[PDB]
A paper describes a structure:
The semaphorins are the largest family of evolutionarily conserved axon guidance cues. The semaphorins signal through their main receptors, plexins, which are single-spanning transmembrane proteins expressed in a variety of cell types, including neurons, cancer cells or endothelial cells. We determined crystal structures of Drosophila Sema1a1–2, Sema1b1–2, Sema2a1–3 and Sema2b1–3 to a 3.6-, 2.8-, 2.1- and 2.5 -Å resolution, respectively. All structures contain the sema domain composed of a seven-bladed β-propeller fold, which is followed by a PSI domain.
Sema1a has been reported initially as a repulsive guidance cue mediating the defasciculation of motor axon bundles in the fly embryo. The genetic analysis provided compelling evidence that PlexA is a neuronal receptor for both Sema1a and Sema1b12. In the crystal, Sema1a1–2, Sema2a1–3 and Sema2b1–3 form a disulfide-linked dimer, while Sema1b1–2 is a monomer and the lattice packing provides no evidence for Sema1b1–2 dimerization within the crystal. Our crystal structures of Drosophila semaphorins revealed that the dimeric architecture in Sema1a, Sema2a and Sema2b is covalently secured by an intermolecular sema-to-sema disulfide bond formed by a cysteine from each of the β4B–β4 C loops of the opposing chains (Cys279 in Sema2a). Conversely, mutation of the cysteine residue involved in dimerization in Sema1aecto to serine completely abrogated dimerization, and no dimer was detected up to a concentration of 2 mg/ml. Despite the low propensity to non-covalently dimerize, Sema1aecto maintains the homodimeric architecture by reason of the covalent interchain disulfide bond. In class 1 semaphorins, two distinct loops with no obvious structural and functional role are substantially extended from the bottom face of the β-propeller, β5A–β5B and β7A–β7B in Sema1a, and β2C–β2D and β6C–β6D Sema1b. In the Sema1b ectodomain, the β2C–β2D loop is significantly extended while the β7A–β7B loop is extended in Sema1a. The linker in Sema1a is shorter by 35 residues compared with that of Sema1b.
Author numbering:
A (entry chain A): 80 to 181, 187 to 513, 526 to 601
B (entry chain B): 80 to 181, 187 to 513, 527 to 601
Amino acid sequence: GPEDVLKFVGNESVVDHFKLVTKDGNSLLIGARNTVFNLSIHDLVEQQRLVWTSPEDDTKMCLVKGKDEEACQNYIRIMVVPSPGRLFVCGTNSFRPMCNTYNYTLEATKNGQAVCPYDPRHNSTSVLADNELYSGTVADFSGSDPIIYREPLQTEQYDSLSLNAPNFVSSFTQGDFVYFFFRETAVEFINCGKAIYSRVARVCKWDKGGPHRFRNRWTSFLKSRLNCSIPGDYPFYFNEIQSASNLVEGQYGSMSSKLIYGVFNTPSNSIPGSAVCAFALQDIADTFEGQFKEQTGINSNWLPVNNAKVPDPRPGSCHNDSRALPDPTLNFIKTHSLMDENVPAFFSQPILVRTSTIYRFTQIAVDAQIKTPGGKTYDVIFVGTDHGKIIKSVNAESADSADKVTSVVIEEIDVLTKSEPIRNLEIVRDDGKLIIVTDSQVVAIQLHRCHNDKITSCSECVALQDPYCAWDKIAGKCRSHGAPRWLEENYFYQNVATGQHAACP
Amino acid sequence: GPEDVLKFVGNESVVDHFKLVTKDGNSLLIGARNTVFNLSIHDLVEQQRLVWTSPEDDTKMCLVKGKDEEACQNYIRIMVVPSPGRLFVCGTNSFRPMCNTYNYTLEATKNGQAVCPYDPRHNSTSVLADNELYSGTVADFSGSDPIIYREPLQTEQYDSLSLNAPNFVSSFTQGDFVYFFFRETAVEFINCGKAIYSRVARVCKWDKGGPHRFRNRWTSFLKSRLNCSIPGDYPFYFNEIQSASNLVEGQYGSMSSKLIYGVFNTPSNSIPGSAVCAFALQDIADTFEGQFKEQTGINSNWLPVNNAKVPDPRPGSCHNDSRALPDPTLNFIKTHSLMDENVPAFFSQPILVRTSTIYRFTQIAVDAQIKTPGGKTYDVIFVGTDHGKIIKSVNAESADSADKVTSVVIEEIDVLTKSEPIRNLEIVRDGKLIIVTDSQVVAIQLHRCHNDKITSCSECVALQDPYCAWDKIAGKCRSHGAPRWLEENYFYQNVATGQHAACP
Ligand SMILES: *[C@@H]1O[C@H](CO)[C@@H](O[C@@H]2O[C@H](CO)[C@@H](O)[C@H](O)[C@H]2NC(C)=O)[C@H](O)[C@H]1NC(C)=O
Ligand SMILES: *[C@@H]1O[C@H](CO)[C@@H](O[C@@H]2O[C@H](CO)[C@@H](O)[C@H](O)[C@H]2NC(C)=O)[C@H](O)[C@H]1NC(C)=O
Ligand SMILES: *[C@@H]1O[C@H](CO)[C@@H](O)[C@H](O)[C@H]1NC(C)=O
Ligand SMILES: *[C@@H]1O[C@H](CO)[C@@H](O)[C@H](O)[C@H]1NC(C)=O
C-alpha cells in the first residue's frame, strides 16, 4: 500500500482514543487509557508524559470476573483548556470517575460524575465554553441514567422522553448554543418496534435554573430527529450514527454554507452499509422553530400539536432571566421536547454511501476548502472504517431530477493493519498530513498524495480529480497546494467533474 | 460454465412463465404469452400447439402509449385439469380476461373476472380442488380490488383490512384447506411507515356463504403474518416474499416434518439481500389457533383481543352448514381477521441467506428426499436469481447452544445468460431441472455428480452432494436414481458428519 511517512506505535494495549490539537501551542495532547502523551505536531516527539495509576482502593473495588483485568482502569476521556490556562483531564479510574485538575501540579480535584463515563465504551463527548464545560454521559455505575452535565444542571431523573440509551458522538458550540449528536432509542417507535433514530439536541449557554424546585432541571431542552435517507420513490433510512465532524464555514457570512458532516450507518441487525450524511445548522434550526411531536398516553388521546398550544415565551432561546420564566410552559416542555419533523439532508442525498462492502464507517475528518485552480472551493471528507481503510473524497453538485450527487472516491488505500479499527481521526492545519488515532497505534501520513506518488504515467494526476493535484508542462512534478508557492500565475488543468475528455494522451 | 445438456429457445419475446408437470401423462404444458406449448418431458419436443390471437376489438381498446405494443396481449396465466379431462386455460387477452374451457374443441367460454389478472404483473396464483377452483387476483381494470374467488364467493368490496396491495405467489390445498402466500402492506404498520409483511391465509373447502346480506362475503377467511428473520439479540426481518414451494412429506405421517419452503427478500428501498425461510403447516396452525390482532380507531381505544371475545363457533373451520352459522361472529370476523402472533421460522433461523451479493432470489424448487448412504433423508433446495445464477443447496440439522444451521452451497455455477432473470423453476420426477425464463427454458441435470471431471478425487468428496458417491475399483462417481447396485457396498460421504480426509 502506501509508504509510512510517520508511524507511532506508542502503546500495546492502552488504545488511545482522545486527542487535542492546538496549533498556536503546536502540541498534540492525545488522550489514552491510564496514560497521557504530549507530542510535537511536526515529528510526533513526546514532550512530557502524564501517567496516572488508578489508586489501589479504586482498582480493588472492581472485581467483575467477566472482562475487567484488561479493562476497568483509568480511561482519560475528556480534556479541555480552561481560561486560567490550567490542565483539565478526567479519567474513568476503574469506574470511579473523579476529575483532577492540573505538569503534575494538582490544583484541585472534583467529582467526575456525569462528565466521565463509568464504562469504557465510546458513548460520551465533551465541549468547552467560555465559563462552563458541556459533557453528556451516564451518571450511575450501570449507566442507566445518561444526562448532560453543565455545572450544576441536570435533566429529569430517568427521563425516557428526553434520552433513552444514547451514544453521544459529537458536541459543539455556536452562538451561545451547544449542540449534541447521539443515537437514542425512540419511545414513539417502540410501539412499532425497536429502532434507533439519530436525534440532535441544543441548549442555551446560560440556563440558571427553574422556579419552584425546578432549579435542578433544564427549561430550554429540545431535540429533533436527523433524517439520513437515500431519497427517491421510497425512502431508505440510516438509523445509527458513529461520528460527526465540526462545523464548516466558507468565506464570508453572507453565504449560507454552514455544513456539519455526520457519519451514519445501518443498525446491528441490518447490513454493514454506512452513509455519510451532511446536515446544516440552518436545516437544524428549521425543525426547532417547527412544532413539537405529539405524545399521548394509553387512556388519553391527543392529536399532533397545533400553533394555539405554544406559549408566549419561545422554547429554546437564551433569556436574560430563566428563573423569572413562567411555569405553564415549564410543565409543557418535558412532554413536548421532541420536534415533529426531522432535519432534511443536505441537497436531499447523503454525501458518501458504501453498502456492498463489509466494513462500516467509524470516524470522520474534514479538511478546509482549498483554492482549486478552477476558481471554486469545495469541502474535503476523510472517513475511516472498522477495517482501517481510509477514503478520501470531495463533492461537486450535479443537477438531475433526483438530485444525483457524484461521490468522488479519490483513493481507498488502506494504511494500517486490517485487524485494528480506526476510532479517531484528525487533520493538521502546518504541512499537509493526517492523524489516524487507532487502538494499536496512531500513524501520520500525508493529507493528499499528489506528491510522493509516481506511476510513471501522466494520467495519474488527471484521473484522480484531486483538488490539490495539478500538472506542469516544462517540469514533471505533480503540483500540490499549500506546500509550494508559484512565482507567478500559470496554467493548470483540472477535471473536477468539469467534462474534460482527455489531457495527457 | 456447464454444458447445455438440453437447449430450448422456443420464442424470442413470448416470455413463457407458466408450466404444468403431469408425470402419468408425461407431458409439460408450459404456459406463455399469445401461445401455449405441450411438450414431452424426455427431450422437450412439442406435441401440439394452441395459438390464441387476441381479437381485434379487444386489442384496439388497449392503447397505452407508454409500453403496450410489446405487451397488452394474451397472457395465459392459470391452467388446471378438471375431472372430466377438459382443458381450462385463461389468458389476460389485452386486459379482457375471459376463461376458455375445452385440442381446439371450445366447449364453452365464460368471463374470467377475479380469476385472471388484467395486468401482466406476477401477482396472481391458482390451485385446483375436487369441485371448485381457487384463484387470487385483481378484479378491476386498474387492479385496486384484489380478491380470492372460489365460485362464486367474493371478499368485501375494496377491503383494506383483509388485502392491501398483495402479490399472490403461491397456493396449495391440504385437507379441505387452501392456503395462499402473498405480500401485502400491513395497515397497522402503515401507521408507522410503508413496509410489506408476508402474510399467509387459508380458507375452508365448502363455504356456501352467509346469512343476512353476508351471502356475498366470506365467513371463514383468516390470515397471519410470516416471521422470516435472523434470530439473535436483535431480530432482522425480511419483508418481501418472491415464491414458495409445495408441501414436503417425509416417510410416514407420525413425523411432524411437513414444511413449505418460501423465498423471501428485502424491500425495494433496502439492499438486495434475500433469505430462504421455511414454514411448516404445524407452525401455521399455531398462529391461526392463537388470538386475533387488535384493531382500534382514531377516537375509540381497544386492548389486544382476549379469549373472552371468541365465540362458541371456532373461526376458520369447515362446517356442514355455513348459512346456519350465527351473525355475531360474522360481524366479528371482518374486524379481527388478522392474527396477533406471527408464524416462527423453521428451527428459528432461515435456511439460506445471501446478503452481500447483488443478485436477488426470484424462485424456488424443492427435490424429494433421496436415500443417502448415511441412512438419513434431507431436503434439497434449488433457488434461482434475477442475475440468472442458480444455486442448489441442502441443509443438515446441527446441535449447538446457539441454533446455527450450516447452509450447504453445493455449486453456484451460472447456466443461462447474465441478462435474463429466472422466473419459474421445476424439478422432474431421469434427474433433470427445468429453468423457465423469459428468453428461453433450459433443461439441465439436477445433480452434477456425473458429467463433472476435474481428474481429482477430492472434488467429489468435498461437494457434500447427497447423490454423489465414490467407488474404489471403478473411477465412476456414483449417483442415486439412475444406477442400480448389484449388491450392498461401501460409500463414504461427509454431509457435515465430521470426516477429515479420504482421497489424499
Ligand atoms: C506540551 O509540550 C510543549 C513543549 O514543551 C509545551 O509548550 C511549551 O511549554 C513550556 C513550558 O510551559 C513553555 O515555556 C513554552 O513556551 C511552550 N512552547 C514552546 C514552543 O516551547 C506545552 O505547554 C505542553 N502542553 C500542551 C498542552 O501543549
Ligand atoms: C399434452 O398432450 C398429451 C398428448 O399425449 C396429452 O396426454 C394424452 O395423450 C394421449 C395420447 O397422445 C391422448 O389420447 C389424450 O387425449 C391426452 N390427454 C388428454 C387429457 O387429452 C395431455 O393431456 C396434454 N396436456 C398436458 C397438460 O399434458
Ligand atoms: C426523510 O427524507 C426522505 C428524503 O427526502 C423523505 O422521502 C422522507 O419522507 C423523510 N422522512 C419523513 C418522516 O418525512
Ligand atoms: C421472529 O422469530 C425470531 C425467531 O425465529 C424471534 O427471535 C423474533 O422475536 C420474532 N419476531 C417477530 C416480530 O416475529
